[PDB]
């Protein structure tokens, strides 16, 4: 790894030059480069409705694109789609397997995606003249459990991550295309841009890789943590993304320079985090912890602005609606809570 | 409330009713794990327990048994082990006739001397503080057909005793059973198996009925 050592060192120098450059024009804190900002007052949220329906712990919750429909995934073998405003269930999909750990909802309202712990992914069709929900494809070819499944701007290109590879595909043909690689540990969080042509990921080692679908090679790699990576997300501008690990410290990174911006942390919080979202205004940030609460953390300052603690177990899912009206959270207590 | 949202309420009520019935059909289901260790006779208890994830279902004495078998997943067990809590009992299988050969993974490790390594990792996990561990022992005939020629002293150097089937069998059962770190609420079981049938399913049936007694005692206000 001699040369690696040399060029990684060059890049650390680069990084140091960028840092030198960072320290040059910036306190780097990027907080004192905001010392003139005005603090934001406490935000006390309130529940709106509690979402029943499941019997076991909830392992997935993806929002729709009209900010109206919601899909959740439980461990009983059930994917449930309903209507939030009114808290009514629209459909109820059984599954051949019962060990799913993630779900996706196409940005067209026509298909959903589920898969976990069975090596095979399944794309389900909803609009059928037949009148019932049936399988449309069953992607196979992986040698492990599927961590995350998503849809790429169309109901014809899905994107995945399982044991150790992130692979792309094509719903019709049913064949892989542009199979990503370059990881060492086990991928467990997959994102993508608003005008999605570049996307980032997070395996078991303290690293994160951003991918570009034209060629299928890492555009950038991010490090800095000392534990796993549970949940990563982006920034509404697309030039930033929020990430999380199993060490209570959430970290925010930027693409142009490639190094952290702020760190969030308090002594009273020694457990881990398990989801991070972001509210359209760019100020607030909601983090679901293992302390049965979801502390919100204004992203410009480093202070708490509310404790939306209402759960009775560890929170495994946390989602803000496309239009930023509200947020949805979900723990292992089998109730989804809507906080507005 | 609009002559159309009322039907959406009726449809939602029908979906909820169907989901509650299917979940009740599945509570009265005993779920076992079959976490083994390599080619250690797993396919055999399975081989005759009936008469990625592998699913086995059988019934006996008006009780339905489904077994989850996982050997293929060569991934971080620590990230999917937290999807298996709530299980009644973790059948764990040890081949008695495995102290002689050498595992293909390394010439230093002893098949068994790892066998009890996998046994210790799975028994002290934080997600398994109160769960019974069924233990089976395979291939007793191989153990009593070469135990004269080969000294059990080759492994476990602290052994001081003869080479009879009874003494060796007692020693290996105690040094396997004495890995538990909390004897207050977690129990370990032991049984000897061979090609003989009808003498292995019934042990599984006894262990599982002891687990159900403890659960009802715990959730009724007595224990």
């Amino acid at each position, epitope marked *: 790894g001699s040369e690696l050592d040399q060029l990684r060192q060059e890049a650390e120098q680069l990084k140091n030059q960028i840092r030198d450059a960072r320290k040059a024009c910036a306190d780097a804190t990027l907080s004192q480069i905001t010392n003139n900002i005005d603090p934001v007052g406490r935000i006390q949220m309130r529940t709106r409705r509690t979402l029943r329906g499941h019997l076991a712990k909830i392992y997935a919750m993806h929002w729709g694109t009209d900010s109206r429909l919601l899909v959740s995934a439980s461990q009983d073998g059930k994917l449930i789609i309903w209507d939030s405003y009114t808290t009514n269930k629209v459909h109820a999909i059984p599954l051949r397997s019962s060990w799913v750990m993630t779900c996706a909802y196409a940005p067209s309202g026509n298909y959903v995606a589920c898969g976990g712990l069975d090596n095979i992914c399944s794309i389900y069709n909803l609009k059928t003249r037949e009148g019932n929900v049936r399988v449309s494809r069953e992607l196979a070819g992986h040698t492990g459990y599927l961590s995350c499944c998503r849809f790429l701007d169309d109901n014809q290109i899905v994107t995945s991550s399982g044991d150790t590879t992130c692979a792309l595909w094509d719903i019709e043909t049913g064949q892989q295309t542009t199979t990503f690689t370059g990881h060492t540990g086990d991928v467990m969080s997959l994102s993508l841009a608003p005008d999605t042509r570049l996307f980032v990921s997070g395996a078991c080692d303290a690293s994160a890789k951003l991918w570009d679908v034209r060629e299928g090679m890492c555009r950038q790699t991010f490090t800095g943590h000392e534990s796993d990576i549970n949940a990563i997300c982006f920034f509404p501008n697309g030039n930033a993304f929020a990430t999380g690990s199993d060490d209570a410290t959430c970290r925010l990174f930027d693409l142009r320079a490639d190094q952290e911006l702020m760190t969030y942390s308090h002594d009273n919080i020694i457990c881990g985090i398990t989801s991070v979202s972001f509210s359209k205004s760019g100020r607030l940030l909601l983090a679901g912890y293992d302390d049965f609460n979801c502390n919100v953390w204004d992203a410009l300052k480093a202070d708490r602005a509310g404790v939306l603690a209402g759960h009775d177990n560890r929170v495994s899912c946390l989602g803000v609606t496309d239009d930023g009206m509200a947020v949805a959270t979900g723990s292992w207590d089998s109730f989804l809570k809507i906080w507005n | 409330l*609009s*002559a*159309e949202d009322k039907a959406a309420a009726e449809r939602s009520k029908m979906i909820d009713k169907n989901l509650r019935e299917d979940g009740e059909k599945a509570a009265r289901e005993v779920k076992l794990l079959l976490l083994g260790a390599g080619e250690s006779g797993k396919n055999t208890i399975v081989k005759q327990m009936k008469i990625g994830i592998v699913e086995t279902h059988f019934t006996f004495k008006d009780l339905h048994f489904k077994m989850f078998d996982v050997g293929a997943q060569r991934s971080e067990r620590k990230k999917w082990i937290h999807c298996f809590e709530g299980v009644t009992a973790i059948i764990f299988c040890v081949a008695l006739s495995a102290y002689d050969l050498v595992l293909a993974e390394d010439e230093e490790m002893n098949r068994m001397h790892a066998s009890m390594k996998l046994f210790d990792s799975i028994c002290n996990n934080k997600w398994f503080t109160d769960t019974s561990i069924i233990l089976f022992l395979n291939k007793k005939d191989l153990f009593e057909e070469k135990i004269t020629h080969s000294p059990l002293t080759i492994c476990f150097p602290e052994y001081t005793g003869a080479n009879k089937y009874d003494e060796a069998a007692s020693y290996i059962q105690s040094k396997f059973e004495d890995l538990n770190k909390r004897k207050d609420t977690k129990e370990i079981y032991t049984h000897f198996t061979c090609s003989t049938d009808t003498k292995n399913v019934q042990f599984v049936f006894d262990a599982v009925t002891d687990v159900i007694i403890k659960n009802n005692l715990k959730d009724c206000g007595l224990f």
Partner: single-chain antibody
Amino acid sequence: VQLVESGGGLVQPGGSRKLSCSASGFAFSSFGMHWVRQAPEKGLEWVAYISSGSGTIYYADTVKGRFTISRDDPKNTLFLQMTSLRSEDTAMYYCVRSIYYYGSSPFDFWGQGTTLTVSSSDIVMTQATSSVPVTPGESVSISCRSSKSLLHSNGNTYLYWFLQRPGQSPQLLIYRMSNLASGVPDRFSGSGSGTAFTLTISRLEAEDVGVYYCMQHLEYPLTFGAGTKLEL
């Protein structure tokens, strides 16, 4: 998918007769059913409705009590047993399949009916127009009028459009105004507010010849409207 009815013919006053509708090609237990009667050279009429699970069977206004109607799920059969014959009920009868949830399209698929013959408040909603001569390539605008604000606090209105080719059963073109149906070209469009409701056709061709209908779904009694025919 296929749905076929049977049980018509000639009856006599005071008597009784049942109609059986068989459906094949889809899951009958997860859909709701409606009955629409259309007399010879007249408009459409709603008869009954039997939701999934047989919870809420409704009935008509002038047919209530006289009629009865049921369904058999194992056989996917629907039994509508009619009581009196008053000779004013000589009409074809069509069955209609519908489904209701967020984003559903009620009255998708219809079916040829039997030609019964007999030996011898609701939100009023009419269409002023009775006939319009049309040449190919000419844009045509049809207008419907109501007597109540079809909007609701939900934020949507309940209006449905239907077309009937000569010699066959009707089909869906425009459910709720700003929504287009499935299997229909993009030529058609619809709009309106309050009471003024309008349907527009940019380019019209030979095949576009038929009888047009507009109907309400805000309240329990379903009210249809007369036909703005289009001859050529």
